[PDB]
Amino acid sequence: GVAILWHEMWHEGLEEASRLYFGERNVKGMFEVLEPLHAMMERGPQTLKETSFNQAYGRDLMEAQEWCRKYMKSGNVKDLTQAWDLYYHVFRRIS
Amino acid sequence: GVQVETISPGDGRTFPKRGQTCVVHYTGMLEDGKKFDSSRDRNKPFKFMLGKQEVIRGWEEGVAQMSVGQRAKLTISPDYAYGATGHPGIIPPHATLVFDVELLKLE
Ligand SMILES: CO[C@H]1C[C@@H]2CC[C@@H](C)[C@@](O)(O2)C(=O)C(=O)N2CCCC[C@H]2C(=O)O[C@H]([C@H](C)C[C@@H]2CC[C@@H](O)[C@H](OC)C2)C[C@@H](O)[C@H](C)/C=C(\C)[C@@H](O)[C@@H](OC)C(=O)[C@H](C)C[C@H](C)/C=C/C=C/C=C/1C
């Protein structure tokens, strides 16, 4: 059970990142889980399964990152709440 | 703890078993009445699985005793919500919360 496919990686990543932020108030830790996963997407899809994942969920995940980056400048936690609304939508669809 | 007061009745029969996802509409507000979150305002219900510690204790115990179609006022103690830490930038420390929640269906 090593998470190799993108939906597997995002599912375990979003679970862990939410546990850090909502469970433990650890914004830094949340970002340390998420930033690498977004960077993986930004490298681009390499396989067919990555391509179809990207077509389904790429826009939503990209927008969640923009809300997080809004938070980085604003400091307004409501912007992280927006991001988590988008991340939860992805999480349910890949569960 | 949590106090459940029925606003609108459900069927009084279909209660959520563990394993099922509860689909709800909610409106969360502080003790004074100021809203902090509402699924109704977004026009998109909230889905979550019960008894997995997914949500705050007031929901875990409160929503468990609701029937399908029921709408209720959940007054939740701070130790049954976010406690001393709170939820930074939304819910402060030692906050009594009030949720107007409607159990729409189970999936
Ligand atoms: C975009 O919106 C936010 C919710 C905002 C966030 C800010 C809030 C003030 C408030 O505005 O909702 C609010 O109204 C509220 O108070 N709610 C929401 C309605 C249910 C009752 C109550 C309320 O308990 O919510 C909860 C506590 C925040 C955290 C939890 C309290 C119990 C404690 O054990 C948890 O430790 C891990 C932390 C948030 C829940 O909703 C979501 C669905 C659950 C979690 C984040 C965790 O379980 C998580 O674990 C690892 C999961 O498994 C999920 C399924 C993983 C997934 C990848 C992330 C989902 C994130 C969704 C975020 C949403 C929907």
Numbering used by the authors:
A (entry chain B): 2018 to 2112
B (entry chain A): 2 to 108
Copy the relevant paper text:
Thereafter, independent studies identified a mammalian homologue of TOR.25−27 In time, this homologue became known as mammalian Target of Rapamycin (mTOR) or, more recently, mechanistic Target of Rapamycin. To address these limitations, we have developed a novel class of “bi-steric inhibitors” that interact with both the orthosteric and the allosteric binding sites in order to deepen the inhibition of mTORC1 while also preserving selectivity for mTORC1 over mTORC2.
In addition, to understand the differences in binding affinities between the rapamycin analogs 11 and 12, crystal structures of the ternary complex of FKBP12, the FRB domain of mTOR and compounds 11 and 12, were solved to 2.8 and 3.1 Å, respectively. Despite these differences in FKBP12 Kd binding, modified rapamycin cores 11 and 12 were potent in a FKBP12-FRB TR-FRET assay (EC50 < 10 nM), all being measured at the assay detection limit (entries 2 and 3); however, differences in the affinity were observed through pS6K inhibition. The C32 hydroxyl 11 maintained comparable activity with rapamycin 1 (pS6K IC50 = 0.04 nM for 11 and 0.06 nM for 1), whereas the C32 methyl ether resulted in a 6-fold decrease in potency (pS6K IC50 = 0.37 nM for 12).
